[PDB]
Design an enzyme around this catalytic site. Structure first.
Site, short mmCIF file in Angstrom:
data_model
loop_
_atom_site.label_atom_id
_atom_site.label_comp_id
_atom_site.label_asym_id
_atom_site.label_seq_id
_atom_site.Cartn_x
_atom_site.Cartn_y
_atom_site.Cartn_z
N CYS A 142 0.67 -1.15 -0.37
CA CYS A 142 -0.16 0.30 0.10
C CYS A 142 0.73 1.04 0.17
O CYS A 142 1.98 1.28 0.92
CB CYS A 142 -1.27 -1.00 1.41
SG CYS A 142 -2.60 1.01 1.51
N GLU A 167 -7.40 -7.04 29.46
CA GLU A 167 -6.07 -5.50 29.81
C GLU A 167 -5.73 -5.61 31.13
O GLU A 167 -5.67 -6.35 32.69
CB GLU A 167 -6.88 -4.40 29.11
CG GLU A 167 -7.81 -4.02 30.02
CD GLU A 167 -8.80 -3.57 28.61
OE1 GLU A 167 -8.46 -3.04 27.70
OE2 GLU A 167 -9.81 -2.41 29.62
N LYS A 181 -19.73 -2.32 24.82
CA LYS A 181 -19.43 -1.29 23.82
C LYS A 181 -18.08 -1.21 22.68
O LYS A 181 -17.29 -1.13 23.12
CB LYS A 181 -18.77 0.16 25.58
CG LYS A 181 -17.69 -0.80 26.21
CD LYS A 181 -16.65 0.02 27.46
CE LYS A 181 -16.03 -0.53 28.21
NZ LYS A 181 -16.29 0.28 29.44
N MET A 185 -22.72 -4.22 33.54
CA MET A 185 -22.95 -5.47 33.11
C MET A 185 -23.53 -5.47 31.77
O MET A 185 -24.37 -4.23 31.01
CB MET A 185 -23.90 -5.82 34.03
CG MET A 185 -23.63 -7.66 34.00
SD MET A 185 -22.03 -7.64 33.81
CE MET A 185 -21.15 -7.36 35.79
N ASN A 245 -4.80 7.11 -0.72
CA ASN A 245 -4.68 6.47 0.31
C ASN A 245 -5.87 6.70 1.25
O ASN A 245 -5.57 7.77 2.36
CB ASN A 245 -3.36 6.21 0.83
CG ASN A 245 -2.39 5.16 1.57
OD1 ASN A 245 -2.12 5.57 2.67
ND2 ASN A 245 -2.87 3.65 0.62
N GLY A 246 -6.22 5.69 2.12
CA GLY A 246 -7.50 5.52 3.06
C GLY A 246 -8.42 4.91 3.16
O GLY A 246 -8.52 4.10 2.02
C1 LIG Z 1 -16.05 -7.51 34.66
C2 LIG Z 1 -16.03 -7.26 33.17
C3 LIG Z 1 -14.27 -6.90 32.41
C4 LIG Z 1 -14.21 -7.02 31.50
N1 LIG Z 1 -13.08 -6.67 30.91
C5 LIG Z 1 -12.67 -6.99 29.58
C6 LIG Z 1 -11.62 -6.41 28.68
O1 LIG Z 1 -10.97 -6.02 29.76
N2 LIG Z 1 -11.11 -6.32 27.79
C7 LIG Z 1 -12.04 -7.42 27.61
O2 LIG Z 1 -11.74 -7.44 25.77
N3 LIG Z 1 -13.31 -7.51 27.63
C8 LIG Z 1 -14.24 -8.03 28.34
N4 LIG Z 1 -14.85 -8.46 29.63
C9 LIG Z 1 -15.38 -8.78 27.82
C10 LIG Z 1 -15.49 -10.33 28.19
O3 LIG Z 1 -13.77 -10.58 27.31
C11 LIG Z 1 -16.32 -10.95 27.45
O4 LIG Z 1 -16.13 -10.33 26.14
C12 LIG Z 1 -18.06 -11.16 27.61
O5 LIG Z 1 -17.95 -10.66 29.15
C13 LIG Z 1 -18.42 -11.94 27.15
O6 LIG Z 1 -19.99 -12.28 27.85
P1 LIG Z 1 -21.16 -13.15 28.51
O7 LIG Z 1 -19.85 -13.55 29.43
O8 LIG Z 1 -22.07 -13.26 29.34
O9 LIG Z 1 -20.96 -14.38 27.46
C14 LIG Z 1 -15.12 -8.00 30.34
C15 LIG Z 1 -16.11 -8.56 30.62
C16 LIG Z 1 -16.67 -8.40 32.49
C17 LIG Z 1 -17.88 -9.00 32.65
S1 F3S Z 2 -21.73 -5.93 41.12
FE1 F3S Z 2 -20.83 -8.15 42.20
S2 F3S Z 2 -22.71 -8.86 42.14
FE2 F3S Z 2 -21.05 -9.86 40.50
S3 F3S Z 2 -22.58 -8.23 39.01
FE3 F3S Z 2 -20.94 -7.51 39.96
S4 F3S Z 2 -19.28 -8.90 40.14
#
Ligand SMILES: Cc1cc2nc3c(=O)[nH]c(=O)nc-3n(C[C@H](O)[C@H](O)[C@H](O)COP(=O)(O)O)c2cc1C
Ligand code: F3S
Ligand SMILES: Cc1cc2nc3c(=O)[nH]c(=O)nc-3n(C[C@H](O)[C@H](O)[C@H](O)COP(=O)(O)OP(=O)(O)OC[C@H]3O[C@@H](n4cnc5c(N)ncnc54)[C@H](O)[C@@H]3O)c2cc1C
Ligand code: SF4
Ligand code: SF4
EC number: 1.4.1.13
Lengths: 1472, 319, 117
Positions: free
Chosen positions: A1, A886, A937, A479, A231-232
């Protein structure tokens, strides 16, 4: 590229230009995609001037007489299969050229060499020919070019008339010609031998090579195009085509004439973004303007509200922004008018562009600084291109215009100052609007009866509206989403729930809205559109607003200003109309709008205030969509505006979709009524109502910016009316008819279902006495509200089954899960095989299945240390893999404990923040992972509250204890797919054993991206779903972003099988997996490995409190407090039992079907059938788009290869062959080599060897030193450790010192160069990205985003660019020169010293989180002194030596920049 | 304030009277909260998603909603939300066994931080509405031309009667005793449930527009077909009264009384009526040795009301 | 391309529903690709079926006339947007056509549906 250009400044033709262009094309083979075939490419092109002598000699040889005036030549691609369509095309071309009166000399067959093209690029190869046209009428040259342009346009229209395919006109002019094709980059002068002639000499040259995402090449898609090279990628192409359709109906210019009628559909069908931008560029250039002005109008600069630019340029950019919508996206452009040659950048400056001036009157610009070989003793100046900058060459005069000089020369044509002042603002009108006429607020009963008619609950005002009015920012959830999708629910879900937002995967980076906010605008203009092909004063007379959202007072003032020019349209339909009242109402409003617009009205107000007990309110989205689409299709949208008054808007997602559908301004009065009625009760405390309204509007504006930033669109003007959403659960007919351009892969409810829902809710609201709003459960579970995936009995049964270790209780749990009504897409599917059941004891052993599950990443910031350790212990016990997420990991757990536990993690992540990534963190794994987007997200960075960052996490991430850490949405390293390939190469060089995993999120169009990343040598793709949990994220991003994984996985599998690429990568999915039935279904769709996530947390004690962000989780799972972490009750046996039960269920199901392995079921789609819910719901969902079964062929339906995908060997191999006494005895060495820009990751494998042998800090500084001479490539010394010293004589391209971990890099110009060190760019973009320790001394100016995410490194450079020290977290950095705008954005750790002469730092710095002062303490002067002394010693500079000589008088010129959070943490205070 | 105070507070029920003082009188043993302490003890709830405090409440009250609307003042809206889904909230908060229904399951109880005092806050925010005239009868808007009959004046009967009268119908209750209220007035003693709030709620019901038929046995004074022909529909809520027995050597001696008659006479004497079985009869336990058989809350009430009236020695036998 | 399929489906569905008939759904014709040559397979299209039911109670001749008009207008529409490789082998309630570019004797192998009873 890569794109590039070469130009002789004086403007005289010479063979050296074309020779150097070909030489530059010969050396870009490392950024492209290799192939096992060796002959298959994906595009290449060159664009040069017409060699009149060559064609005149050809014409003489034929037998004619060579004319005097310039000759014209055109190159055409004709069909090759049929020998009759060629004759038809020739007839058309000849009868159209001779229609104007020009003389045709004849046709010529271009000699080619087909023996070098691959197998697929040859089956679709067209027949290449040239036609020679001479100017016998004696007309001028400009008129000649105009006539040729019109001829080409009409020929294209004619040949499209008779539906003939495979016809293209690569160029038709008397000035320039284009040679392009689908061969390799270096094989160009072999396929086209004409360029080897000695008569091809020009005064300019452009070249381009691309990187495709699929493997079906089409020759008319290779670049360069006619008068452009890009390019892009462009973000707003679905939004710009619509506004072009609207502008076409009024544009005209006296140059074309009647033939203007043949130029109406200016953007054809079947083009790419860089083709559409090129077409509009050319039609704007041919009408009178010049290349710089058209570039300024199409891709403008950032209209910053600063005094660092003269107001002449401000008026210029104001006019250019008011005349046309921008074309966003990462873009490096190298365009050429007939006279000028311009090279330019976009607003953000994401792609690189570097140029070089020689003494021979030659300028060479491109993507790298070592493509052409030039001796150092002949250069005059080296430079770069900042964001929005441009550099031009005037050939007719022979002059070189840099940025500011070109701006000044361009700002002298027209008096923009006297033109701009015709605009009028709104806040002035709101002030002169006397504070009288305030209407009466509605009664409580009326307010409740209007709120019930839309389904607003009491939690919608106590959870997501109170924070807006209180603080001015949206809420925060903790959550994942477990609610049913919109179409499968039974309550009233508004129409704004069926539209999911979009984002940008690896092909496109998002934009940081918290730091890079200065380049994002929310301006609005009423009375703006007009003829875009004139220059007058009427174009800058309009009404200007600073935000698309309006309050009630501002809307009343705007209505008073508009007066009798607007037209009010009702938007209600009768409740007793019948079964087709909604359709009749839509037709009525879309006819009344057209009747009112033709009558002279220039403003359309779509008010629905007439909602009563006998008239229901049409949903605002559907109404505004119908009206906008009808105005577009009737050539009337360019006349009027479209203002909407909605009674349903409460959050930032409703305004987003209303503005994306096409509305101009949106006023929400019911939310303001609710705010006033809640304030009069005394709930907000003591703030006035004006403060509440201001905070609410601020929250809405920030939410709009955040939503618009997830895609890369940085202006609201080019985002409105583009439809940047996805419709799930709507009919194909309805979507294709009322909404401009959206995809609805599966169908949904038509108009009858919407009418039924609306009428039922309206009856519930207006036929019964309401006493209070329903409590409502949508974010939290309530008995009255909707259903949820995780309920009480389910959780308790699962926990009891896992604790007591009873398979029967787990079967009861799975039955309870699989007996509820449908809530997801996989609930409408049913398994049905045709074989006979087999005994259960014959299927694969439980171990062989448990070794297919993993646990996804959960960062140590979110979880407690105990929970992370528990998960890691449990997964390393059964043989499967885990993930660290992470936030890095603790090094002390890098060994098995005394009992036999292994607290490590087999999969390390590489996040966007690079939070703990070091050289040892990467050599302690078995698989790496590049997290692009998360399930909850998408297109946004992970958050971590301030109080959650204790001292332990501070030391673990190298940050400041007690400050909020938000990762940047982009990577600053992945700005395109070639950047991803480069990062994968780096990661495979640092670890010679791991496999690279790419994590994506399901959406529409993910198949092409997955097919692209498969060519980048990745071997594992991860498709996260829309229902994934998280530690902290806003609610609007949780509930209204992403798509179910069933779509993304089923699309990726098909697209990979189609391109013969499925047999090389393994697919993995996660998100919402609870039982074994879902596992079997996902395996049938194509996945091979599975991620569990949230269920694991439920086995360890989590009870879905959803208070993870507030740091008060009762069971102590996601907490950093001590007294709560004392309440942990987890145990690895629980997770082991959960995984065992999950595997036994899959064994049971496989035995019941009739197979004996998960391999026999992967990809077998025919075992899935669709069943409907019944004959009372009447939803037209057709899941067949995901049940489509493409036939693989002779390859299997899964990965059939062992080991990773290997990569070509770099220079480091040779070094490893030479520095053997270092690894065998441990003695100092010293090596010297030659560097070239086609050698990537110079010195990374050696770093791996050293880390494995001695460790990160085992050798003294400077144990082994390497000396390179020349232009180093990309990623110079990435992830180097202490004891390695690279010394470059020359310059490095990009990413120099990425991930440094204690090493040392020294860059200095050569000894024989006549260049000022402090006036020439020496290094490139994204320097020291996420380094943790070491040094780096450069003797020039750095590039863009200098020292981002620095944590421990100490760097000394003699200059910088834009966005320097962005989000620096630790270390010191000295800058001996000027800086760019937005300096030290988001800095939260470290210190900076700037040598500023012209006293201009207060104009460039971003004084938000840092303070800048003068040096006052000798303890801080000694640091600077020693740093500059070491710089002088290492690089032997002359500027720094001069500064050190005059120390007493130059110490008073330094500015010291210190963060605000380190003012009370330093040992030696910075003040007196 | 942000109600997540289960981290820096501790569960404490309202003030209880000592053991040396409870034995004498027949009044209740607990006391209503103070505003400053109720506002703090309602601040402990975690506002948790999937509230287990609601899943295990048979009436399924929106506990977090009024638990929140209490911690910020605004007690009128809290009373409204609480009353919107339960007819007798004060009786429930006084007598509902919480260690197995509501205070035994919420998220901070499983974590051994102690459970939110839900029933006491229910009592508090429902009794403070009487003290300001916020409680009003539910008269039907438009009088409907139909009549419904119910057999029994217990909790189910009264709840169904209130709901029917709020619909718009016309109702007639049929109770056997002289004072309506079911065994809420004759079975449950005076220290568990005070006899004032019961008659208060019954008077509110009477003001709503219901019709009371005291001293009316459905077996003697009427017949099922007759009442069936009278109204449009009849609701049988007669309850349960046939007690069990025991047959063993000596099961025919004297002073072997059933629990219900003892509790009825005790409640009557606590009201008055000077029944003769209390003066000269085996339904007093002034200076005697009492022993009760069987278990449950019935035996609990019996043993407590026995130890109230002297009863030098009392024992309970559970199997 | 997996996008032109969706455009064609959108066109077909928005044209059939314009007259008022009821769409039951789409069906993927099971085939066996292992018997086609190398050149007749590189240009093989995706074969599908759409099921339309007559809910208006109209006669059979009028049904056939409406289906003919629908097919003609669908062809015109799909030719409007310059989409290639689209064809309607048959659209009726009386007859159907199974054709392709395979061998004459290999017909009942490529289209196994005809082996049904
Ligand atoms: C408390 C918490 C922290 C998470 N931290 C990360 C993260 O740091 N990096 C990442 O790629 N996904 C993170 N996830 C998402 C999980 O890696 C995974 O994609 C997700 O929990 C799948 O959803 P499920 O458990 O309902 O199947 C996190 C999820 C939770 C609940
Ligand atoms: S606030 Fe505590 S009870 Fe489970 S859903 Fe989150 S770790
Ligand atoms: C904390 C607590 C304490 C409890 N304590 C006791 C206790 O001490 N003793 C006990 O027995 N139960 C007790 N219970 C049981 C509990 O009160 C019952 O489950 C509940 O009261 C059932 O009421 P009901 O709807 O059956 O009406 P009941 O309270 O049973 O009243 C039914 C009504 O029907 C009337 N009736 C009966 N027969 C006829 C007839 N033939 N014709 C006309 N009217 C008739 C009765 O006189 C009475 O008015 C207790 C429960 C709880 C939660
Ligand atoms: S009562 Fe228990 S479950 Fe309910 S909100 Fe309070 S702490 Fe949570
Ligand atoms: S005390 Fe109140 S909230 Fe608790 S279970 Fe009893 S009635 Fe329900």
């Amino acid at each position: 590229c890569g794109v590039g250009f070469i130009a002789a400044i004086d403007g005289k033709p010479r063979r050296s230009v074309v020779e150097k262009g070909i030489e530059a094309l010969k050396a870009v083979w490392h950024r492209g995609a290799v192939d096992a075939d060796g002959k298959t490419g994906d595009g290449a092109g060159i664009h040069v001037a017409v060699p009149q002598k060559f064609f005149k000699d050809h014409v003489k040889v034929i037998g004619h007489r060579a004319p005097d005036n310039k000759l014209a030549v055109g190159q055409v691609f004709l069909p090759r299969i049929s020998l009759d369509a060629q004759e038809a095309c020739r007839c058309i071309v000849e009868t159209e050229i001779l229609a104007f009166g020009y003389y045709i000399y004849g046709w010529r067959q271009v000699p080619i060499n087909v023996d070098i093209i691959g197998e697929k690029a040859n089956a679709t190869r067209p027949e290449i020919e040239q036609i020679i046209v001479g100017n016998n009428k004696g007309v001028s040259d400009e008129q000649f070019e105009l006539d040729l342009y019109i001829i080409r346009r009409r020929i294209e229209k004619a040949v499209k008339g008779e539906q003939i395919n495979d016809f293209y006109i690569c160029s038709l002019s008397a000035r320039s010609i284009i040679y392009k094709g689908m061969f390799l980059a270096e094989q160009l002068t072999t396929f086209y031998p004409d360029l080897l002639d000695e008569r091809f000499e020009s005064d300019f040259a452009i070249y381009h090579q691309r990187y495709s995402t699929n493997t079906f090449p089409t020759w008319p898609l290779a670049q360069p195009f006619r008068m452009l090279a890009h390019n892009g990628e462009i973000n707003t192409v679905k939004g710009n085509v619509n506004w072009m359709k609207a502008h076409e109906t009024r544009m005209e210019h006296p140059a074309f004439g009647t033939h203007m009628q043949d130029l109406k559909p200016v953007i054809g069908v079947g083009l790419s973004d860089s083709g559409s931008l090129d077409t509009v560029f050319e039609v704007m250039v041919r009408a009178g303007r010049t290349a710089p002005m058209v570039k300024m109008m199409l891709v403008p600069q950032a209209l910053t509200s600063s005094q660092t630019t003269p107001d002449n340029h401000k008026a210029l950019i104001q006019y250019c922004n008011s005349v046309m919508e921008p074309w966003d996206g990462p873009a490096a452009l190298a365009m050429t008018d007939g006279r000028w040659v311009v090279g330019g950048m976009d607003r953000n400056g994401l792609r690189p562009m570097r140029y070089t001036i020689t003494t021979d009157g030659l300028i060479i610009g491109g993507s790298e600084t070592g493509m052409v070989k030039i001796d150092e003793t002949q250069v005059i100046e080296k430079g770069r291109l900042g964001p929005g900058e441009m550099i031009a060459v005037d050939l007719q005069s022979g002059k070189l215009y840099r940025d500011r000089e070109l701006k000044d020369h361009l700002a002298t044509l027209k008096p923009w100052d006297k033109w701009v002042q015709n605009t009028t603002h709104l806040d002035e009108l709101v002030k002169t609007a006397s504070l009288k006429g305030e209407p009466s607020d509605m009664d409580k009963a009326e307010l409740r009866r209007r709120q019930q008619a839309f389904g607003l609950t009491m939690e919608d005002m106590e959870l997501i509206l109170h924070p807006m009015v209180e603080d001015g920012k949206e809420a925060i959830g903790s959550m994942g989403d477990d609610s049913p999708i919109a179409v499968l629910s039974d309550k009233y879900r508004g129409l704004h729930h069926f539209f999911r937002q979009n984002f940008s995967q690896v092909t496109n980076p998002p934009i940081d809205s918290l730091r890079e906010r200065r380049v994002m605008s929310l301006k609005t203009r009423l009375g703006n559109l007009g003829n875009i092909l004139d220059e007058d004063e009427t174009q800058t007379r309009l009404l200007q607003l600073e935000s698309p959202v309006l309050t009630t007072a501002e809307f009343r003032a705007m209505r008073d200003y508009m007066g009798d020019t607007a037209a009010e349209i009702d938007a209600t339909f009768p409740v007793d109309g019948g079964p087709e009242a909604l359709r009749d109402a839509l037709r009525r409003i879309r006819q009344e709008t057209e009747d009112a617009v033709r009558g002279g009205a220039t403003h359309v107000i779509l008010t629905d205030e007439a909602m009563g007990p006998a008239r229901a309110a049409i949903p605002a989205i559907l109404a505004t969509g119908a009206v906008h689409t009808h105005l577009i299709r009737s050539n009337l949208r360019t006349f009027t505006s479209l203002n909407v008054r909605t009674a349903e808007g409460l959050d930032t997602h409703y305004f987003a979709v209303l503005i994306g559908v096409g509305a101009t301004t949106v006023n929400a009065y019911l939310a303001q009524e609710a705010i006033a009625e809640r304030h009069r009760r005394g709930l907000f405390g003591s703030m006035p109502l004006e403060k509440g309204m201001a905070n609410y509007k601020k929250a809405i504006d920030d939410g709009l910016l955040k939503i618009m930033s997830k895609m890369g669109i940085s202006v609201i003007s080019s985002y409105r009316g583009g439809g940047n959403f996805e419709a799930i659960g709507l009919s194909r007919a309805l979507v294709a008819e009322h909404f401009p351009a959206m995809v609805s892969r599966i169908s949904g409810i038509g108009l009858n279902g919407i009418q039924k829902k609306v009428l039922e809710q309206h009856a519930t609201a207006y036929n019964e006495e309401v006493v209070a709003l329903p409590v409502g459960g949508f974010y939290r579970f309530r008995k009255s509200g909707d259903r949820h995936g995780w309920e009480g009995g389910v959780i308790h049964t699962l926990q009891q089954a896992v604790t007591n270790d009873s398979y029967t209780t787990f079967k009861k749990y799975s039955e309870q899960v699989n007996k509820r009504p449908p809530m997801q897409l996989r609930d409408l599917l049913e398994l049905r095989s045709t074989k006979a059941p087999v005994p259960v004891d014959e299927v694969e052993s439980i171990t062989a299945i448990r070794k297919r599950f993993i646990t996804p990443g959960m960062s140590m910031g979110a979880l407690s240390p105990e929970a992370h350790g528990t998960l890691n212990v449990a997964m390393n016990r059964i043989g499967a893999k885990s993930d660290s997420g992470e936030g890095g990991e603790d090094p002390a757990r890098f060994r098995p404990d005394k009992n036999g536990d292994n607290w490590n993690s087999a999969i390390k992540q590489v996040a966007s923040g690079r939070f703990g990534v070091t050289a040892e963190y990467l050599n302690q794994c078995r698989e790496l992972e590049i997290k692009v987007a998360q399930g909850a997200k998408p297109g946004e960075g992970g958050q971590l509250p301030g109080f959650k960052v204790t001292e332990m996490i501070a030391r673990l991430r190298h940050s400041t204890p007690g400050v909020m850490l938000i990762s940047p949405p982009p990577h600053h390293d992945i700005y395109s797919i070639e950047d991803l390939a480069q990062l994968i190469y780096d990661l495979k060089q640092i670890n010679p054993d791991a496999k690279v995993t790419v994590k994506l999120v399901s959406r529409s169009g993910i198949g092409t991206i997955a097919a692209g990343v498969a060519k980048a040598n990745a071997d594992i793709i991860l498709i996260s779903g829309n229902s994934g949990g998280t530690g902290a994220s806003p609610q609007t991003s949780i509930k209204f972003a992403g798509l179910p994984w069933e779509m993304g996985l089923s699309e990726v599998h098909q697209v990979l099988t189609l391109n013969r690429l499925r047999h090389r990568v393994r697919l993995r999915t996660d998100g919402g997996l609870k039982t074994g039935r879902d596992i079997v279904i996902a395996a049938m769709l194509g996945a091979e490995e599975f991620g569990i996530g949230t269920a694991s947390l439920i086995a360890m004690g989590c009870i879905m409190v959803r208070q993870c962000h507030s740091n008060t989780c009762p069971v102590g799972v996601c907490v950093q407090d001590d007294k709560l972490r004392q309440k942990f009750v987890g145990t690895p046996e629980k997770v082991v039992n959960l995984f065992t039960f999950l595997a036994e269920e899959v064994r049971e199901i496989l035995a019941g079907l009739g197979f004996r392995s998960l391999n026999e079921v992967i990809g077998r789609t025919d075992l899935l059938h669709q069943v409907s819910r019944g004959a009372e719901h009447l939803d037209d969902l057709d899941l067949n788009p995901r049940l489509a079964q493409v036939d693989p062929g002779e390859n299997a339906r899964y990965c059939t290869l062992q080991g990773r995908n290997e990569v070509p060997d770099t220079l480091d191999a040779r070094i490893v062959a030479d520095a053997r006494p270092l690894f065998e005895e441990g003695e100092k060495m010293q090596l010297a080599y030659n560097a070239r820009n086609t050698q990537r990751a110079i010195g990374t494998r050696l770093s791996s060897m050293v880390t494995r042998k001695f460790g990160m800090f085992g050798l003294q500084p400077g144990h082994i030193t390497i000396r390179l001479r020349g232009t180093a490539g990309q990623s110079l010394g990435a992830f180097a450790v202490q004891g390695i010293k690279l010394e470059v004589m020359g310059d490095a391209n990009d990413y120099v010192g990425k991930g440094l971990s204690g090493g040392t890099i020294v860059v200095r110009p050569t000894t024989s160069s006549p260049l000022e060190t402090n006036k020439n760019t020496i290094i490139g973009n994204t320097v020291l990205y996420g380094a943790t320790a070491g040094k780096l001394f450069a003797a020039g100016q750095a590039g863009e985003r200098f020292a981002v995410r620095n944590s421990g490194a100490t760097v000394v450079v003699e200059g910088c660019g834009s966005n320097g020290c962005e989000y620096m977290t630790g270390g010191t950095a000295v800058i001996l020169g000027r800086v760019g705008d937005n300096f030290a954005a988001g800095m939260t750790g470290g210190m900076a010293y700037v040598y500023d002469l012209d006293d201009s730092l207060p104009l460039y710095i971003n004084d938000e989180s840092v303070i800048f002062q003068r040096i006052e303490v000798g303890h801080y002067e000694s640091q600077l002194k020693h740093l500059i002394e070491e710089h002088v010693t290492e690089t032997q500079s002359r500027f720094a030596a001069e500064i050190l000589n005059d120390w007493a008088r130059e110490v008073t010129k330094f500015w010291q920049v210190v963060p605000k959070e380190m003012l009370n943490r330093l040992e030696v205070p910075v003040h007196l | 304030q942000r109600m997540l105070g289960f981290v820096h507070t501790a569960q404490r029920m309202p003030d209880k009277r000592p053991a040396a003082e409870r034995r004498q009188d027949f009044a209740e043993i607990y006391a209503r909260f103070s505003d400053e302490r109720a506002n703090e003890q309602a601040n402990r709830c975690s506002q948790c998603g999937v509230p287990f405090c609601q899943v295990h409440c048979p009436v399924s009250n929106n506990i977090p909603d009024w638990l929140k609307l209490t911690s910020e003042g605004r007690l009128e809206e809290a009373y409204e939300v609480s009353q919107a889904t339960n007819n007798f909230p004060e009786i429930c908060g006084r007598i509902c066994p919480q260690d197995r229904l509501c205070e035994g399951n919420c998220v901070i109880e499983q974590s051994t931080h102690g459970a939110v005092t839900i029933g006491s806050v229910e009592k508090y925010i429902n009794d403070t509405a009487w003290d300001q005239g916020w409680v009003k009868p539910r008269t039907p808007s438009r009088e409907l031309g139909l009549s419904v009959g119910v057999i029994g004046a217990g909790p189910a009967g009264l709840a169904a009667a209130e709901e029917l009268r709020a619909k718009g119908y016309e109702v007639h209750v049929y109770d056997r005793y002289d004072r309506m209220g079911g065994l809420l007035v004759y079975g449950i003693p005076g220290f568990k449930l005070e006899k004032s709030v019961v008659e208060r709620r019954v008077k509110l019901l009477a003001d709503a527009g219901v019709i009371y038929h005291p001293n009316f046995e459905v077996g003697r004074d009427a017949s099922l077909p007759e009442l069936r022909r009278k109204h449009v529909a009849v609701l049988v809520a007669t309850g349960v009264y046939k007690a069990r027995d025991i047959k063993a050597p000596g099961s025919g001696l004297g002073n072997i009384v059933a629990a219900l008659d003892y509790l009825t006479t005790s409640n009557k004497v606590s009201l008055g009526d000077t029944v003769e079985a209390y003066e000269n009869g085996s339904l007093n336990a002034a200076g005697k040795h009492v022993v009760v058989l069987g278990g449950g809350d019935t035996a609990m009430d019996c043993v407590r009301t026995a130890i109230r009236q002297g009863a030098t020695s009392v024992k309970c036998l559970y199997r």
